[PDB]
């Protein structure tokens, strides 16, 4: 009735997507074979949001998995929870992109998109009332950022009056493992700023930082990093699937956050995260969620909001709970932190409450934060791209595939206009009106 079609691009997208379907099948009570083994009756009331009915009482996900290397597709097939996916939806090539954005966007990925859009159209038209799409990919690769941005451009032209989420893994300076990351990054940010409704910046430094000093975790494997990524992406759309006292889906969240269509780069965060040696020393109460949600430790990007200004924020709560404390605690942090919150817009906090908690927890919360402090990542990508493009380094790997040198120049101008656009809104006088 309100269907979200899932899109996975690249090796990083498939590792995230495999854990995401594992975390919400447990939430809805689905065995790896495909049937339903649960204890409540409201788990099947709204299950067509992500699942599609099959014969014999079997549920298959509404996901398509796309890659340019067949090695990942067999791994995500033969994984712990890879049996539930329909084998038609596994679309793949034979030659990899090669950590090259030009191969994925112009030459190699230009032939794979004919097969992908036929499957996407086939799966989206079957919905009675399509709600929107959702994509998980990484900007540091070739088959996720080269061809994932092409999937962005075709879908937005075909389905204009639809809402599209993306979960972009923004590249990181300190734990970078690929030399040509700023080449792949700045050629894709222009595609995400023009043809995407919501963008969430998920960074591997913050996933490592949460797993080190908050969880006190010994070995933070990629499964543990994707465990945090699947947390916010399960919790952001929990008002769609479960009833609550104050319901707000992702479209109502989109209206209350985005003041201008060029400002849609957000920051996620999951509130109730404790370590094994400190959980039984802590009480689970609404002020304890609000304190752990708003500090800069739990932000899932390399952005410190102290340098910037919080533009507009969310809190999506989960659990049976009395929302005086929800209506009081974010007012208290509104009145205290006067400088961090921009005074040009009053009472910018958006509130939603869902009745059904996650499995095994009685209370939980999720954060979405639009801040001007996101512009320091684009400036860091700009300076690393400027310092290397000026010497024409690694350029023959890109200019030999047909794209000329002016695409880089306009990619610089589009990002420099973006970082300046955030800068005017950060330093703007509210109590004045202009020439208009």
């Amino acid at each position: 009735m309100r269907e979200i079609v899932h899109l996975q691009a690249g090796q990083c997208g498939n590792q995230i997507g495999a854990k995401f379907w594992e975390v919400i099948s447990d939430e809805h009570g689905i065995d790896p074979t495909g049937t339903y083994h649960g204890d409540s009756d409201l788990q099947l009331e709204r299950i067509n949001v992500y699942y599609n009915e099959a014969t014999g009482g079997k549920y298959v996900p509404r996901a398509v998995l796309v890659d340019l290397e067949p090695g990942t597709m067999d791994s995500v097939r033969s994984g712990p929870f890879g049996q539930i996916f329909r084998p038609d939806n596994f679309v793949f090539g034979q030659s990899g992109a090669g950590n090259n954005w030009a191969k994925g966007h112009y030459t190699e990925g230009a032939e794979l998109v004919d097969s992908v859009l036929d499957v996407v159209r086939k799966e989206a038209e079957s919905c009675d009332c399509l709600q929107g799409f959702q994509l998980t990919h990484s900007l540091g690769g070739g088959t996720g950022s080269g061809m994932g941005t092409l999937l962005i451009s075709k879908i937005r032209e075909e389905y204009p009056d639809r809402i599209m989420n993306t979960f972009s893994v923004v590249p990181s300076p300190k734990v970078s493992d690929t030399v040509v990351e700023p080449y792949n990054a700045t050629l894709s940010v222009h595609q995400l700023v023009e043809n995407t409704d919501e963008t969430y910046c998920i960074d591997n430094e913050a996933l490592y930082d949460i797993c080190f000093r908050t969880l006190k975790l010994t070995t933070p494997t990629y499964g543990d990093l994707n465990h945090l990524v699947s947390a916010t992406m399960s919790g952001v759309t929990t008002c769609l699937r479960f009833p609550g006292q104050l319901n707000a889906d992702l479209r109502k969240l989109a209206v209350n956050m985005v003041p201008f269509p060029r400002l849609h780069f957000f920051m996620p965060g999951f509130a109730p995260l404790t370590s094994r040696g400190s959980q039984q020393y802590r009480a689970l109460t609404v002020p304890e969620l609000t304190q752990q949600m708003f500090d800069a430790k739990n932000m899932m990007a390399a952005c410190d909001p102290r340098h910037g200004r919080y533009l507009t924020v969310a809190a999506v709560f989960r659990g049976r709970m009395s929302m005086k404390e929800v209506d009081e605690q974010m007012l208290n942090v509104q009145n205290k932190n006067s400088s961090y919150f921009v005074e040009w817009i009053p009472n910018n906090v958006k509130t939603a409450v869902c009745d059904i908690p996650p499995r095994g927890l009685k209370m939980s919360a999720t954060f979405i934060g639009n801040s001007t402090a996101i512009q320091e990542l684009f400036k860091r990508i700009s300076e690393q791209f400027t310092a290397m493009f000026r010497r024409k380094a690694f350029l023959h790997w890109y200019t030999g595939e047909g794209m000329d040198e002016m695409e880089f120049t306009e990619a610089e101008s589009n990002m420099n206009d973006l970082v300046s656009e955030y800068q005017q809104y950060q330093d703007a006088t509210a109590e004045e009106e202009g020439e208009f």
Binding site: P70, G71, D74, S75, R77, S78, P80, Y222
Partner: protein
């Protein structure tokens, strides 16, 4: 002077050139992201491409979960 204990006794039989060392990956081999189908008794980290090959250019193999 005095008495020194020898090397500790091996709890399990050990023989190099055939034995795979205990790793975190081989401890959690069926539960890892990135690990293909497990059909080998020597190492579970040998590649399987039964699902990845097209319908032409394929020998008759065994698909996973089949």
């Amino acid at each position: 002077e005095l008495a020194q204990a020898g090397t500790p006794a091996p709890t399990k039989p050990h023989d190099y050139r055939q034995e795979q060392p205990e790793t975190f990956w081989i401890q959690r081999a069926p539960q890892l992201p990135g690990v293909s189908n497990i059909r080998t008794l020597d190492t579970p980290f040998r590649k399987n491409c039964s699902f990845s090959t097209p319908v032409p250019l394929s020998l008759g193999k065994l698909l996973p979960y089949e």
